[PDB]
């Protein structure tokens, strides 16, 4: 199969890793809870 | 499916309950070591933390090779003068204080994917092996004294356990303390460079206490006991039921968790409820035994008699051997 791979540019500076993903849940869930406690109609 | 009965014991009084419970259908799933090995090999890597060397480690010099005509190799050399470092080796892989072979990068693959249905296959095969006393003991558990290897305790006794003195008392009543003392007596220290990283103590594995939704207060009691791990019935995985990829963990079920098993995993004919899309598989063989086929074929006079190979005589010389 004819290969079409776009790694000629500096991909090493283009690499984005998702190591913060398990902590986005904790951030968003906690903030989502905090808004509910502030004015529960708002988070509706 | 006759599904033999299972007794439920009182953890405080030691008295069996008057109402037996049918064995859940999850205990008759095929016990596939190869499927468990595939899942455990993938899942055990999911706790790994990213690591990597410095990106600029060993590349922080302006070195260029001296070229030929100087009676030295062509590896790059540090520039300048006045110190011992100048004129020495440079970035090269084999040089001292240079970068190594392909440097480890923090974007490696630390976690491994696995299909969900193959993960549920391995848990059912790991649960079934926990009801085989031969496989439980061969894994390294002392279960010679327990009444039933699918050990269930009353949910009434569990609800009263609030201290580790009571949790230890219950474990003594149901004859499960042999494993707890094996872990206590055999605790030792790690052998190697793992002690500088903080990993010093190396204990063994003991009973696993599987509890339901009504047993959230008894968790705190069992957690300080050495070599006793607790897990909720829904959160079972290969990392609990087969530590070290050796199936047959000694499990202590509670009444609430034992009865929920049928709903969670379903039967061989009913699709599961807790795990939608999954159904217990049928083993390649209906009855995993070879004796009943032989005796029936023997009764039909089909098998030939057992053959013992004749002793082939050694070659002789008829011209010289009269016999």
């Amino acid at each position: 199969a004819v290969s079409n791979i776009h790694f000629c540019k500096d991909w090493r500076s283009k690499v984005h890793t998702w190591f913060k993903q398990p902590f986005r849940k904790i951030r968003r869930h906690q903030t989502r809870v905090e808004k509910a406690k502030a004015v529960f109609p708002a988070t509706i | 499916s006759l599904r033999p009965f299972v007794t439920i014991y009182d953890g405080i009084t030691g008295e069996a309950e008057k109402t037996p419970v049918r064995l859940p259908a999850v205990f008759l799933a095929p016990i596939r070591g190869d499927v468990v090995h595939f899942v455990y090999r993938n899942q055990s890597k999911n706790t790994r933390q990213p690591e990597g060397v410095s990106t600029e480690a060993g590349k922080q010099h302006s070195a260029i090779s001296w070229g030929t005509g100087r009676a030295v190799a062509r590896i790059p050399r540090i520039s300048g003068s006045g110190s011992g470092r100048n004129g020495q080796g440079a970035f090269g892989n084999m040089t001292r204080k240079g970068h190594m072979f392909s440097p480890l990068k923090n974007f490696r693959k630390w976690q491994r994917k696995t299909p969900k249905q193959m993960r549920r296959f391995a848990v059912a095969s790991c649960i079934a092996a926990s009801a085989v006393p031969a496989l439980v003991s061969a894994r390294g558990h002392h279960i010679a004294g327990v009444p039933q290897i699918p050990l269930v305790v009353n949910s009434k006794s569990i609800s009263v356990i609030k201290k580790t003195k009571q949790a230890v008392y219950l474990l003594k009543k149901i004859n499960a303390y042999s494993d707890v003392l094996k872990v206590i007596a055999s605790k030792t220290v790690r052998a190697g460079q793992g002690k500088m990283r903080g990993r010093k103590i190396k204990e063994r594995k003991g009973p696993l206490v599987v509890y339901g939704n009504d047993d959230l207060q008894a968790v705190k009691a069992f957690r300080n006991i050495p070599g006793v791990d607790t897990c909720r019935v829904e959160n079972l995985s290969v990392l609990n039921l087969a530590p070290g990829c050796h199936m047959g963990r000694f499990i202590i079920w509670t009444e609430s968790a034992f009865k929920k098993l049928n709903t969670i995993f379903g039967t061989q004919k009913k699709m599961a409820q807790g795990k939608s899309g999954f159904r217990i598989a049928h083993a390649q063989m209906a009855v995993p035994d070879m004796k009943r086929v032989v005796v029936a074929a023997e009764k039909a006079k089909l098998l030939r008699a057992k053959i013992v190979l004749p002793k082939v005589p050694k070659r002789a010389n008829p011209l010289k051997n009269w016999a």
Partner: protein, 210 residues
């Protein structure tokens, strides 16, 4: 297991904070235990050590009892007048002792130890009354489920369940065929060894009977 995310379980970080701790936290670390006579008088387990105190060495070559002559917090040691070693040419030098190998037998209590000891005493009592409140609550919930029993059963001997009800499961025939060779051989040898021990035990009992 630790659950406070602020504190660290790293052995290296613990030692670094031990060496670089200031004088304020060094005093509270060189504590010693009171003796029986002093414990009964004050109801205090341990207090930080002080100069002009009288201690008794309990671990070491010489278990002498003397007076504390130096509390060296930089070296985390203390000095006793009785424990000395002659330095060849004739002069004697004190021998350093870790403060965890001694127990105090006579306090040097001017005015701040008195305030400390009273504060240390009430803290013990306040915790004792709090543990008692929890213990009855645990006992109260145990009676509501087993009204015929009392909580003292947990401190006595335990009688194991001797009933041996077996279960028929259509996998015991496959048990030998579900082990790998390294764990099959060990399992079979354990069976062979166990049988031979039972054979000798049986023969011995027959000889004992006869």
């Amino acid at each position: 297991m630790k659950f406070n995310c602020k504190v660290s379980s790293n052995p290296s970080k613990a030692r670094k904070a031990l060496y670089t701790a200031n004088a304020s936290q060094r005093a509270l670390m060189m504590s010693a235990r009171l003796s029986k006579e002093l414990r009964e008088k004050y109801n205090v387990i341990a207090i930080p050590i002080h100069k002009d105190d009288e201690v008794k060495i309990i671990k070491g070559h010489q278990k002498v009892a003397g007076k504390v002559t130096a509390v060296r917090r930089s070296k985390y040691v203390i000095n006793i007048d009785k424990l000395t070693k002659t330095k060849a040419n004739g002069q004697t030098v004190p021998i350093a002792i870790r403060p965890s190998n001694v127990i105090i037998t006579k306090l040097f209590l001017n005015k701040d130890r008195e305030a400390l000891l009273a504060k240390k005493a009430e803290s013990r009592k306040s915790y004792k009354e709090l543990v008692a409140k929890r213990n009855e609550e645990v006992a109260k919930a145990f009676t509501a489920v087993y009204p015929a029993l009392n909580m003292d059963i947990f401190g006595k001997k335990v009688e194991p369940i001797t009933e041996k009800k077996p279960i028929r499961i259509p996998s015991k025939k496959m048990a030998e065929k579900l082990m790998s060779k390294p764990t099959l051989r060990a399992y079979k040898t354990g069976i062979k060894v166990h049988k031979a021990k039972n054979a000798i035990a049986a023969y011995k009992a027959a000889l004992a009977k006869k």
